[PDB]
């Protein structure tokens, strides 16, 4: 049984939007910071520096600008960084209007997005998984060759930008990454161990997300208010971590981000907290471990964290055949938040079991499973931009 969200801590009933946003959504984002995903330290550090490396106006053959921006976290040049790719449709700043924004981290480097030869190939450690790898090296070889999770063409004829960044900029993804991470930099102070309350990967990977969005805020081609954050698997549990602790991300989409993600932990189903902790002991804070084979006692769920979205548009989606997330796990922690979205006016999925396949079901928050494998296709992105279409925050008053 599950913690309501509508209830305090203290027991007393939240019965209306202002209680939320101002007494509820800071209990729960401290308990997910406690408990699960360890303390972000600060937000935006003083001193980032925006460094545009490259703009072309006719990427894509004519229907983008593609610019390449450094986005450093600090102002001395010795600070840590990370690499910004964004395509813009050149069908709409070229009518002076700045475009909305789909903005997620990428798993294997920017050039990974697409084939396109012009994209600076990653300097950073890549994990021996990323397909044409050598030694953990970007190659020539790997170029596009995750373009299948990116339909980049689609998206902008579509009329959106598209922003990536490598999430092993921020942590690389393997145990000992956050030693050589923006975590390693931003505090810690003259200790070894990580505290037990310290951010991990998932942490780390949404704060750069913000940072991202900080970016895109000085950006006159685009729209900082009309940014959608999505992630597929491990880095949809950081879109879901970064849209819930800042609101100025207007549309989230989480894809098949299961166990810690949308996934309830209290559903004993798929991946466990036992072994997510135990497989990657670097994604959550040490203080989640205390969990492991104890869902029990966790004192929140992640339809908690779904509900710190509210009353954004969300979206959450799963794969048929896709076990390990749980499928059924995420469409319940929809429906255990739809209460909070349901106080700020929105609706959530029609009914109280999973939709047949290919039939998204809810209003601004919405779930649809797909047929097939764990992945993120063209399948899931068309139901994501109609998404956008509809529930994407104006451009107008
Ligand atoms: O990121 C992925 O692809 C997935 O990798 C592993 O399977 C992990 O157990 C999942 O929690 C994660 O979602
Ligand atoms: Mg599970
Ligand atoms: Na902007």
């Given at each position: 049984?599950?913690?309501?969200?509508?209830?305090?801590?203290?027991?007393?009933?939240?019965?209306?939007?202002?209680?939320?946003?101002?007494?509820?959504?800071?209990?729960?984002?401290?308990?997910?910071?406690?408990?699960?995903?360890?303390?972000?330290?600060?937000?935006?550090?003083?001193?980032?520096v925006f460094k545009v490396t490259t703009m072309e106006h006719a990427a894509l053959?004519?229907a983008a600008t593609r610019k390449e921006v450094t986005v450093?976290?600090?102002?001395?040049?010795?600070?840590?960084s990370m690499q910004l790719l964004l395509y813009v449709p050149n069908?709409v700043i070229?009518?002076?209007?700045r475009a909305?924004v789909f903005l997620?981290?990428?798993?294997?480097?920017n050039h990974?997005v697409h084939?396109d030869?012009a994209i600076a190939?990653?300097?950073?450690?890549?994990?021996?998984?990323?397909?044409?790898?050598?030694?953990?090296?970007?190659?020539?070889?790997?170029?596009?060759?995750?373009?299948?999770?990116?339909?980049v063409?689609?998206?902008l004829?579509?009329?959106y930008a598209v922003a990536t960044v490598?999430?092993?900029?921020?942590?690389?993804?393997?145990?000992?990454?956050?030693?050589?991470?923006?975590?390693?930099?931003?505090?810690?102070?003259?200790?070894?161990?990580?505290?037990?309350?310290?951010?991990?990967?998932?942490?780390?990977?949404?704060?750069?997300?913000?940072?991202a969005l900080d970016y895109l805020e000085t950006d006159p081609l685009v729209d900082a208010?009309?940014?959608?954050?999505?992630?597929?698997?491990?880095?949809?549990?950081?879109?879901?971590?970064?849209?819930?602790?800042?609101?100025?991300?207007?549309?989230?989409?989480?894809?098949?981000?299961?166990?810690?993600?949308?996934?309830?932990?209290?559903?004993?189903?798929?991946?466990?907290?036992?072994?997510?902790?135990?497989?990657?002991?670097?994604?959550?804070?040490?203080?989640?471990?205390?969990?492991?084979?104890?869902?029990?006692?966790?004192?929140?769920?992640?339809?908690?964290?779904?509900?710190?979205?509210?009353?954004?548009?969300?979206?959450?989606?799963?794969?048929?055949?896709?076990?390990?997330?749980?499928?059924?796990?995420?469409?319940?922690?929809?429906?255990?938040?739809?209460?909070?979205?349901?106080?700020?006016?929105?609706?959530?999925?029609?009914?109280?079991?999973?939709?047949?396949?290919?039939?998204?079901?809810?209003?601004?928050?919405?779930?649809?499973?797909?047929?097939?494998?764990?992945?993120?296709?063209?399948?899931?992105?068309?139901?994501?931009?109609?998404?956008?279409?509809?529930?994407?925050?104006?451009?107008?008053?």
């Amino acid at each position: 049984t599950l913690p309501d969200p509508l209830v305090g801590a203290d027991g007393t009933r939240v019965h209306d939007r202002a209680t939320w946003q101002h007494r509820r959504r800071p209990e729960l984002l401290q308990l997910f910071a406690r408990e699960v995903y360890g303390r972000t330290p600060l937000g935006r550090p003083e001193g980032m520096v925006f460094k545009v490396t490259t703009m072309e106006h006719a990427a894509l053959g004519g229907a983008a600008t593609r610019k390449e921006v450094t986005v450093r976290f600090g102002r001395d040049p010795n600070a840590p960084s990370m690499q910004l790719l964004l395509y813009v449709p050149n069908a709409v700043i070229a009518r002076a209007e700045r475009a909305p924004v789909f903005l997620g981290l990428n798993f294997y480097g920017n050039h990974t997005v697409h084939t396109d030869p012009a994209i600076a190939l990653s300097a950073r450690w890549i994990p021996a998984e990323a397909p044409n790898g050598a030694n953990h090296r970007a190659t020539e070889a790997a170029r596009g060759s995750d373009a299948q999770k990116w339909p980049v063409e689609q998206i902008l004829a579509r009329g959106y930008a598209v922003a990536t960044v490598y999430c092993g900029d921020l942590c690389p993804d393997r145990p000992d990454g956050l030693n050589a991470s923006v975590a390693s930099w931003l505090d810690a102070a003259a200790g070894d161990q990580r505290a037990p309350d310290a951010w991990g990967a998932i942490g780390v990977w949404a704060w750069g997300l913000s940072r991202a969005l900080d970016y895109l805020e000085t950006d006159p081609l685009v729209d900082a208010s009309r940014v959608a954050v999505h992630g597929h698997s491990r880095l949809g549990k950081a879109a879901l971590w970064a849209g819930a602790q800042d609101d100025r991300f207007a549309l989230v989409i989480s894809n098949e981000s299961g166990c810690g993600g949308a996934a309830l932990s209290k559903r004993i189903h798929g991946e466990t907290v036992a072994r997510i902790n135990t497989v990657f002991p670097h994604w959550f804070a040490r203080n989640f471990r205390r969990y492991d084979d104890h869902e029990e006692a966790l004192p929140v769920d992640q339809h908690e964290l779904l509900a710190l979205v509210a009353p954004r548009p969300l979206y959450v989606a799963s794969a048929e055949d896709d076990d390990w997330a749980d499928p059924r796990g995420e469409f319940l922690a929809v429906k255990a938040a739809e209460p909070v979205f349901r106080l700020f006016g929105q609706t959530g999925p029609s009914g109280e079991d999973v939709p047949r396949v290919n039939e998204p079901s809810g209003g601004a928050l919405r779930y649809h499973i797909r047929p097939g494998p764990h992945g993120m296709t063209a399948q899931d992105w068309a139901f994501y931009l109609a998404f956008a279409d509809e529930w994407l925050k104006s451009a107008l008053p």
